[PDB]
């Protein structure tokens, strides 16, 4: 889709194995904020969002937090923290026809800049006068959307780039998206370095007399530290005490 | 003027209006240091100047607080602080002459 | 997009003449339609545009007292009327919409209008 | 607004790049867009838009024409030329009420 329209799939309940993207040499640019691209096969989230579209490449730059331009003040606003990565990559040859390709669109004019991860698809005949529009276009009232025009011979800026971005949210909450990590046995009475759905720690794991209710999943004590976990595989529940520390 | 032979203009004893920049389309290199863009219109200052002058540009890049090359080294640096902005354009159509 | 127009109008010095052009294709009331005269071999002037929605009508400076603009929605047809009609009006009047942020854009025939007695 | 369309009679063979030159008085960008738009026009035919905007193409526009420039100066460029490119070429402001035309040039093929 256009950026103006971005299309948004959300991405849950799977085993994602993000090595294909990274090993593929495609992809022209695979800038990862808050994470590691090499790690990311280790990390489980929340939740993820792919988002892609068609841009410019000259504008590929403008996909980052705190950037500013024309796709990020009116088309496609990334948060500052973003948590994710974005994944540029150069596809003049499916994007560019003969003639020219006008399918994709970009928003010139809005009246504001649009809130992070915000979409506006709509067409209404934006007023840079003062005289209100009322819906015509005329002098000062234009239309928002204006097309690329791309065509089979352009500069490398301006040939057509296919941008995913993928959101992911990294919290305690439970996690849908995982990679593959394969799994272990469990066991209970020895000090161990467990790796609960994403969770990192040293310490042994007792069977837990705390009655968890079905939506809790994890405990934390007073000064907020987990002593207590679900395993995600026999939804059983399991305090952690870190392992003997003492001075000599 | 020519970059070596840079032309400064002082800006004092009046009011700005920046809107001229944020109109403009021919503006490639926006570039501020110390200063938010957007902001220009609610900032005073005590004295501006405005030094101007014809680059190439491939050399755009070197007009920028702690940079190195032929243009920073020999013909125009800038300081490491700098509160100033940079505006820089395309002048194909202008400055350049059958010949 | 396609407007045709009125062929051919002769008038006598003085006179006054209505052409009318009519639109296709489009709604017609919410693009802004724009009037443009072409002397003959010569350069093009941009005679006014009216807005059909509200029959708010702007002239050039030249062409503001012997120009009127009309509009009519019904029949989706714009009109222009010259009066005071002399010599140098003699030309080939175009009828255009406004499309991609330029004030005359999808233009139609012509109308040639010859002031001889 | 006046604009002065420089070579306003142009003789160029086929397979050659023909430019056409237009200024302004006053500033044509605004809003950070340019508004100077290039017009084609066939004899017995009327004006067809080339170049909305500095550089972006109409429809139906093969890519030989090209638009390009800013602030008060811009040019329209057909680096290979066709036999069916002799016509009449106009440029057109669009950032003042008042619309104006420039001259106009007129393309011929040369020998």
């Known amino acids: 889709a256009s950026v103006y329209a971005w299309n948004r799939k959300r991405i849950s309940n799977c085993v994602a194995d993000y090595s294909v993207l990274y090993n593929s040499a495609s992809f022209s640019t695979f800038k990862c904020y808050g994470v590691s691209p090499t790690k990311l096969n280790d990390l489980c989230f929340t939740n993820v969002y792919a988002d892609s579209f068609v841009i410019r490449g000259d504008e590929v730059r403008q996909i980052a937090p705190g950037q500013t331009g024309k796709i990020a003040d009116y088309n496609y606003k990334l948060p500052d923290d973003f948590t994710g990565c974005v994944i540029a990559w150069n596809s003049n040859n499916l994007d560019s026809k003969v003639g020219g390709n006008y399918n994709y669109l970009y928003r010139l004019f809005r009246k504001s800049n649009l809130k992070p991860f915000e979409r506006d698809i709509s067409t209404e005949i934006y007023q840079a006068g003062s005289t209100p529009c009322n819906g015509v276009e005329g002098f000062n009232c234009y239309f928002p959307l204006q097309s690329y025009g791309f065509q089979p011979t352009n500069g490398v800026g301006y040939q057509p780039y296919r941008v995913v971005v993928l959101s992911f949210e990294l919290l305690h909450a439970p996690a849908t998206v995982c990679g593959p990590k394969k799994s272990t046995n469990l066991v209970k009475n020895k000090c161990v370095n467990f790796n609960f759905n994403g969770l990192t720690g040293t310490g042994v794991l007792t069977e837990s007399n705390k009655k968890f209710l079905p939506f809790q999943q994890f405990g934390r004590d007073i000064a907020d530290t987990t002593d207590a976990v679900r395993d995600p595989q026999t939804l059983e529940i399991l305090d952690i005490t870190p392992c003997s520390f003492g001075g000599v | 003027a020519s970059v070596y032979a840079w032309n400064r203009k002082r800006i004092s004893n009046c009011v700005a209006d920046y809107s001229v920049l944020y109109n403009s389309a021919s503006f490639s290199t926006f570039k501020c240091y110390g200063v938010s863009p957007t902001k220009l219109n609610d900032l005073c200052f005590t004295n501006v100047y405005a030094d101007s002058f014809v680059i190439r540009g491939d050399e755009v890049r070197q007009i920028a607080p702690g940079q190195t090359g032929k243009i920073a080294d020999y013909n125009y640096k800038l300081p490491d602080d700098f509160t100033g902005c940079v505006i820089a354009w395309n002048s194909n159509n202008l400055d350049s002459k059958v010949g | 997009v396609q407007l045709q127009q009125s062929a051919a109008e002769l008038a006598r010095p003085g006179a006054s003449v209505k052409m009318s052009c009519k639109a296709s294709?489009?709604?017609?009331?919410?693009?802004?339609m724009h009037w443009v005269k072409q002397r003959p071999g010569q350069g093009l002037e941009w005679i006014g545009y009216?807005?059909?929605?509200?029959?708010?009508?702007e002239y050039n400076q030249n062409f503001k007292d012997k120009t009127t603009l009309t509009a009519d929605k019904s029949s989706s047809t714009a009109y222009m009327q010259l009066n005071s009609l002399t010599s140098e009006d003699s030309a080939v009047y175009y009828c255009?919409?406004?499309?991609?942020?330029?004030?005359?854009?999808?233009w139609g025939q012509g109308t040639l209008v010859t002031v001889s007695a | 607004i006046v604009l002065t369309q420089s070579p306003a009679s142009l003789a160029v063979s086929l397979g050659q790049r023909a430019t056409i030159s237009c200024r302004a008085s006053?500033?044509?960008?605004?809003?950070?867009?340019?508004?100077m738009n290039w017009f084609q026009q066939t004899p017995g035919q009327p004006p067809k838009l080339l170049i909305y905007?500095?550089?972006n193409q109409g429809s139906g526009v093969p890519a030989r024409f090209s638009g390009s420039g800013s602030g008060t100066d811009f040019s329209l460029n057909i680096h290979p030329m066709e036999e069916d490119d002799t016509a009449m070429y106009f440029c057109?402001?669009?950032?003042?009420?008042?619309?104006?035309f420039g001259g106009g040039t007129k393309l011929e093929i040369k020998r």
């Open positions: 057109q402001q669009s950032k003042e009420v008042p619309y104006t």
């Open positions: 255009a919409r406004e499309g991609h942020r330029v004030g005359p854009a999808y």
């Open positions: 006053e500033s044509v960008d605004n809003y950070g867009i340019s508004f």
């Open positions: 009216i807005n059909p929605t509200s029959g708010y009508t």
């Open positions: 905007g500095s550089s």
């Open positions: 294709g489009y709604t017609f009331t919410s693009y802004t």
